């Protein structure tokens, strides 16, 4: 039993934000919401769907319906930027957490990512190894998914992806490598790197027949 | 003779610090029957029992939320039948009186 | 304060067992579940297990069954998690959190959390980087601008330095953070953007320095010759 949380959420300061948690018949249970600041332990911000622990301001509201739970933030402050998770206790599966949703309070205009894909070098194939490189720079908000496709078939093994970091420009950078044997590279028509950012995917492709 | 029913639910809200009782409106309706049913079904899974009393820590009150519906019947006693049906359709089945359903 | 405190960070090698602890204060230990949750850096939360000390009851995750063990010392108000043999995949931050026992008075969720303990498993041995040139091409060029760079792979430990033409070049250079791969070895990429007209004459050179191995390497980034 899985929970479908959205990867990224971004809103301007002082405006109301919402965070969704999609479950099959999720209204028939109690959902809790946890806050985690980067580098710190989580914090219970909402339990029993609407209740608030002490020290949590009225700005945090919760709700739950048949197949969608929501967490609403009022009077948004720059201090509420962080990763938010939803959690339940399933009849069979015990504890389940949401994939996690990054919430960012905007300090600048949104910006799309600069995506560059690089095939393996010649000097690297003579060493019986191959690496595809997908580099993403200057994007904001700082949350992007990635996927790889070998000839339009997804691929998850051999992929190593960077946690986004704060570029000097107060913008974000990240990277993803894919490791292959020379033969796997030479035995596919193309390889495609899909970088998703704020509900917009960029698909960049390459091919062994490189020139 | 369009009859009436009174479906009542019980609750007890934790009094907020220095809050006008006019607040509890929310505290009252946020905790309807469906919520009580799924809260009981959810706590059961990780429920452990302990004699030690945790009930005596705070001050709170007990209240009731009742809602009313109406129906017309050509016959006098047939009404109840419909009620029961409708209850099973959208409401919890409490104890029945003459018409009043109580869950508490 | 109702608080939980977890043991200090630990770095181990695959195969060696390890036990970590979680000591709580300010409440009655046996009246609350203690859950253990895993978080690989840069990833979600992964619930591993939970223990009620009053009965000693334990409940694990399907996956984390054979790997880990959970114990509870009621006399010291302490919970313990243990591996008999460690792996690389277990490198992560581990959190212990209190959880109400199913009563209206208590909070029925993970209310109190611990600071966390980092567990790092890496057989990685000091190794020097291999440097490869990411050459530009049509798919690396859009409207005058064209990108190129260097890939540094299979080096340990951190850090390395990347410059371009002996630090002369500073405009259009992004040096990306390094990824910690499964092998415990790192890799990164340095990229630079430049006009396309220059690809022919201007020679671009990336300088990589990994002091751990005394490994200095300069690569020329030639445009692919088709």
Numbering used by the authors:
A (entry chain L): 2 to 9, 11 to 95, 95A, 96 to 106, 106A, 107 to 211
B (entry chain G): 119 to 138, 151 to 228, 235 to 240
C (entry chain H): 1 to 52, 52A, 53 to 82, 82A, 82B, 82C, 83 to 100, 100A, ...
Task: Give sentences from the paper.
We recently isolated two mAbs from an HIV-1 infected donor (CAP228) that bind to V2 peptides, confirming that V2p epitopes are in fact presented during HIV-1 infection (van Eeden, C., Wibmer, C. K. et al., manuscript submitted).
To characterise the structural differences of the entire V1V2 domain between these two states, we determined the cocrystal structure of CAP228-16H bound to a V1V2 scaffold from the autologous cofounder strain CAP228(Min) at 3.2 Å resolution. Despite the addition of a hairpin constraint at the V1V2 termini (provided here by scaffolding onto 1FD6), the V2p epitope was efficiently captured by CAP228-16H in the same helix-coil configuration normally presented by short V2 peptides. In this complex V1 is pushed into a more helical fold (absent in the less constrained complex) that kinks at position 161 before leading into the V2p-associated α-helix bound by CAP228-16H, identifying potential V2 conformational switch residues in the N160 glycosylation sequon. The additionally resolved N- and C-terminal regions of V1V2 loosely encircled the CDR-H3 of CAP228-16H before inserting into the scaffold. After rearrangement of the V1V2 termini, the resulting structure of V1V2 in this CD4-bound orientation is unknown.
